[PDB]
Point group: D2
Chain length 440, copies 4
């Protein structure tokens, strides 16, 4: 599953529909990023630029011009064909091929952007620009507007109104098309396969980074070359560090390992967390904490639907957590009083859910305290966890236990669809999977 | 093999030995780098900062103060311990543990650098600073010097002399210690294992990126988590693009694949290229080009030694290439006349060798046209290639063939040591390796 | 005559009337400007900031908040009272006195602008800001918007729309109130007195700068401390340099001197040019050129009125100039053909008229080729000139003659009022004035 | 008196003598400065650039190249001849005339500085540059060094050492040549004439700014077009504000007026302060404070000589002040105890002396607490004052009195020469001068 030229075009048209007549929208590509000295990190296109183009080159700018309420057109600035640059660094789309390939009306060399952009903006009323997104982009836009402002003797005029298109575009991104959901479903499947593999490969004495290696290889083999975020493999006390990425320790017989990893497939993020015993068998203490986190996740998965909110579901999770922690003696007191005091916060200190899409922490307005009412087409994670610090003032057997279990879901008309349920999470199923693997 | 605290300390002392009395050297850590939105790329420390510290955190500055010719000391600015930041993002060394861990005299919070740095520079004659390396660093240094310049009523004075330490430090880096050579030897071995694996796994119909996946998994399993540069897997006509990294094509029965890949092990780069038939058997045309490139590499490996130069060895390679291309009818004319006209350049358009170390294209002065005389302790690549474009005006059977073969060597008292000869390169050995793998 | 608190308030209200509900307008003071080392030029407030405040301090920001269509208020950020800063550098208005003195609702310390501005902008739909006017202002505004954009977890939101208020404000400035016209009338009178003085003081052997001295002293004595632009005193060939300000030459018996000078009175510019003989008597050649320029000015003064344009009046002037130059043999050919070829341009190369107000080249849209139809309340200069270069291919007696004659006018319902006719311009009146002075 | 081409050349040579072999010094002109909108302040050349050139244009850079210990040469970058720019804005020296006019070896267009500067710096060991002086200059220098650093394949190399030339140049400026002393002597005479005029013109009911007008006219008539700093005319309580420049009040019968004003003559500053009765007669209270300030000045003038210091002379002044204030009942207690407590500081809160030259607060190292031993050729002010605030807890008759009396001196072999004693300061002489003027 992928996103096609025609869908990128529909998105551009949907933006144009929202624009004022006599306006232009400017969407800039991500800069290349140095890793060390003359070597660069693998290129990652800006998500908003990607959303409107599917074009994976730097030094590119999409310009959507809405001349009036019926007439509009698109111009792409992009790198020119250049034999020498291409022999060295790779092929470039260039200007001749771009209109047909991408479905834009005109393409111009990026090297000419300062000579041409002001001409496209001249006489317009409004420019849509994400001010502050990139320095290089602000320089280009500010230079063009200055030429126009100062050019009255050449009959030039600048648009007086600049509107940030991020709020409009991020609201578009928040609601996925069926094609996007299909891509995210595949990302979920690929990510789940990787997590199953990690559980099947894990043995005491392996390093945390070995499981990262297994996961990344699995992503690759299905065509997801890069992860969507830096993979977390936190064994033992490291599982109590939320975004632990050092992954440098030897995994010990008797510890849990928490793996938070997700692929990037056609631009879209998977995001799964599983926690499991390094030796294939939960201890009693580990199981007691795990059961609370799993009940939190299972309850959330029953509840998420149009018309509820992340805030509302979080309330149910907090009750499950406080109730369970009281039963184990980790918290002491009356459940309702403890809930009123947010007594769970030392052990569950992050949010239950975030939006998911072209970014792992995806764009879109949450509302105050994540109170926004859910609607079909929203995609979000569900990620309860409990983290009992090595020095917590709790019964000793629970110290140093970090557990998170996370699935990705899409809100549907009828509830939600779980995109990541193909990797096991019930403790007996985890144990069975690992027992079967350990016998090979 | 690794680099130890005591070696980092010896390096700092070696720099101090070269500094003027009444001076301070300032070495800044790399900034964290955004990948998309709120997600960052995996952190890569600045190579020069790494060289003097082995410390893998951002927001850190090493200050070496040479008060006079016998008295000197070191101060590290680094991130403070912070429970909340650490629960979220990972542990920090902090100030209490840093002096013993790193072997510096004093450690101070990075948050206090603007309140403290000018106090360390006050009254010194010289500051060593890599101006222009990082914007954030220039801001800090410039602010401190301005405070001092403008602070005469508070009895403050700025050092009037600013010296770029890059030339001195890069000359240090150019000559490897035995410990560095041991690390590079392991990087070479790990990289060679990965290339052997790629040859054993390659089959027609696999995608170029599949071999990248195999290579990266092999790096990981030996403790080299990241590649030293973006892996190149160029099959067919893609092998004629020097740093092709798209790796997006299906590998065809009858094509060659060129793989240029290297691990980063304890900061140090491996860098190997092998070219081999996707189907395990070179065609006659492919073998004819391969033989010329291999003779170029084998001759270079015989010749490299103290007292020669990259320029001198390149001359021998150019003769081998022109002679071979004339024999096949790719070039026409008198060999010596063709050499005088640099007639090889359409087919071999890059350098034979680059320095190798903490960067894949490592630091250090080459001399005009890479004429610097070689000395023991220098580490360099040897990477002849021939690239016959799909549209080259040559006998048709050679069009679209891109071949490079690259080894990493260290210059010794007695010649050179090849760090990467554990992955095969003779065509009969490549074929035998692949035949054996294809039968499994 | 001056502009009062209540008028500044009416202007602020007039701007608020034009603003969208749920918006804030930000108007920043001019920075102080270094002359040399630690010495600054005399402070000149930004004209737009002045227009809305009459407040002559730096480090001040006026914020007009339009909460909805009936409710609005103003906040001033300005320097705090500070005994030491005030003993050294002068008194400051401060926060307690500002609301009553300036007629704003609230005043806050400038030192707190970064802690407070984002709070004022939070939740608004539109911010009016002159982007690119001042670097320091852009930094403040951009920082505030960034805090808001990134502050969703603190329930903060940024206005998505930024509108340049310059076009609206400059259209306000283009049409003067009766009070502004009264101030400009006084500026005209003061400037005219200075020009009369220069004519009465001029003698051969004085330096050009001596007349600048007389002019500036006259401005001062009437309470116009500073000129509105750098005074031009161009004698002989220097009169052919349009904005000659060196004023370094000894004025020669037999040369003309062109003086372009204007006061700044309560923020408003006078702008007069007179050209006259250094020795008090025009030569025949000088008179022949002078007569053409004077006829151009006199005709323009008859014609300027509501419903015509600078372009239209310029056409009449060009005909007068071409006709006169043909009669003297400076141009040769048919007048209408010469007009069609713009044959006057080597000798009259600037515009006839510019707007006049808080800036000498005042703000406001001219229309293409200065075609905008004139309306009552517009204030403009009328400044024909002829400049015959020392090396011009013309009859020799005209070479090196530079003449400009300039008056300031206000368009009225019934034509125009000349604000500067109290300094003579008829050649016989100039001669009589100088003869009378030279006899003393 | 002026500074000639040959002296500017001697200065350049004196700098070259101090430079390391294989070095270049870069000295940049001041930028033009906006006053309002498209109008600029009158141009003021950077003092250090002026010191080495006597060239009064912006967009100019002096480059002194010391190739080795016997060979050196100079290159000027400056604006090209351009007919249109010159018809509008004034004549330019250009490249053809510059070598002879200024005495430099070569001149190049400023428009070519980025194409040429790196070529001049290539292969040098040291660059002398005043980092942070001007943004535009830092951009040019940093760009050139970056081209060189990154240009090894084009055989380019950057100087690794950057030295601030300000300390060396400011030490040069601190010691005046006989020609400089002659210029400063004339500046002193011109400034003194202006102060005499102000005393002769002052009458009750005039505004403070009227005396500024008289002073500036007097500067102008002697060829000092601009003041060296903004003129201070502080009458009554305004005399207690040290750099009061509003000069907006009506001068009252019975008040003192303090005038601090100085001309700029051929680049050099005069700096005189006189305080006198607006009505021509000191009251008893005014005379009692005046006598203490005058004794302080007269004693300082007797004492200043080679081998003493500003700190040492200040000690004598503090004793005179504390002794006098005790006698009047403004201070109470034992003189030596009061001195030990710095009890004078509420009334004399600034320094006695500053260096004087191309800047009014001239360059040069003072030493801790202005302790540097004085030597012949140093030029400094002597400016005791007493300022009794309107609300001071002192006998009522002294409240609101601000008195400063300031002369400019040059240290000679034999003591000092007073450059400003031609304007009276003894109270009986002030009264006689004013009485004589008031009778006219
Ligand atoms: Cl391009
Ligand atoms: Cl910190
Ligand atoms: Cl403040
Ligand atoms: Cl130029
Ligand atoms: Mn998540
Ligand atoms: Mn996750
Ligand atoms: Mn290589
Ligand atoms: Mn390589
Ligand atoms: Mn004018
Ligand atoms: Mn004018
Ligand atoms: Mn002074
Ligand atoms: Mn003074």
């Amino acid at each position: 599953s992928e996103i096609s030229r025609q869908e990128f075009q529909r998105r551009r048209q949907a933006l144009v529909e929202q624009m004022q007549p006599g306006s232009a929208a400017l969407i800039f590509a991500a800069p290349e990023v140095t890793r060390s000295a003359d070597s660069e990190y693998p290129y990652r296109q800006n998500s908003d630029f990607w959303y409107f183009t599917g074009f994976n080159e730097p030094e590119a700018v999409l310009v959507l011009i809405k001349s009036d309420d019926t007439h509009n057109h698109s111009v792409l600035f992009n790198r020119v064909r250049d034999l020498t640059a291409e022999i060295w660094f790779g092929r470039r789309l260039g200007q001749d091929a771009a209109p047909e390939k991408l479905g834009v009306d005109r393409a111009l060399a990026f090297s000419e952007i300062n000579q041409q952009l002001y001409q496209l903006l001249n006489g317009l009323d409004v420019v849509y620009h994400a001010q502050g997104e990139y320095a290089y982009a602000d320089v280009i836009v500010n230079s063009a507007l200055e030429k126009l402002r100062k050019g009255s003797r050449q009959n030039l005029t600048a648009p007086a109104t600049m509107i940030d298109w991020r709020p409009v575009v991020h609201e578009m991104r928040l609601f996925k098309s069926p094609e996007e959901i299909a891509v995210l479903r595949r990302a979920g499947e690929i990510t789940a396969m990787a997590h199953t593999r990690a559980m099947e490969k894990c043995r005491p004495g392996m390093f945390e980074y070995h499981l990262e290696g297994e996961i990344h290889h699995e992503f690759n083999r299905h065509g997801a070359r890069y992860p969507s975020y830096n993979t977390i493999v936190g064994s033992g006390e490291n599982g109590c560090i939320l975004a632990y990425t050092e992954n440098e320790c030897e995994m010990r017989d008797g510890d849990l390992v928490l793996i938070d990893a997700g692929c990037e497939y056609k631009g879209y993020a998977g995001d799964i967390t599983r926690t499991f015993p390094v030796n294939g068998k939960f201890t009693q203490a580990q199981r007691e904490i795990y059961d609370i986190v799993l009940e939190s996740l299972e309850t959330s998965l029953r509840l998420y639907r149009p018309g509820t909110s992340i805030l509302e579901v979080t309330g149910e999770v907090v009750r499950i957590m406080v109730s369970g922690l009281v039963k184990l003696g980790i918290l002491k007191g009356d459940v309702d009083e403890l809930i009123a005091q947010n007594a769970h916060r030392p052990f569950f200190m992050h949010g239950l859910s975030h939006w998911l899409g072209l970014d792992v922490h995806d764009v879109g307005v949450y509302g105050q305290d994540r109170s926004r009412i859910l609607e079909p087409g929203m995609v979000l994670t569900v990620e309860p966890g409990l983290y009992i610090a090595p020095d917590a003032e709790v019964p000793e057997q629970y110290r140093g236990i970090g557990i998170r279990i996370e699935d990705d879901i899409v809100i549907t008309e009828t509830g939600n669809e779980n995109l990541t349920a193909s990797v096991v999470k019930k403790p007996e199923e985890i144990e069975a999977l690992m027992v079967a693997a350990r016998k090979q």
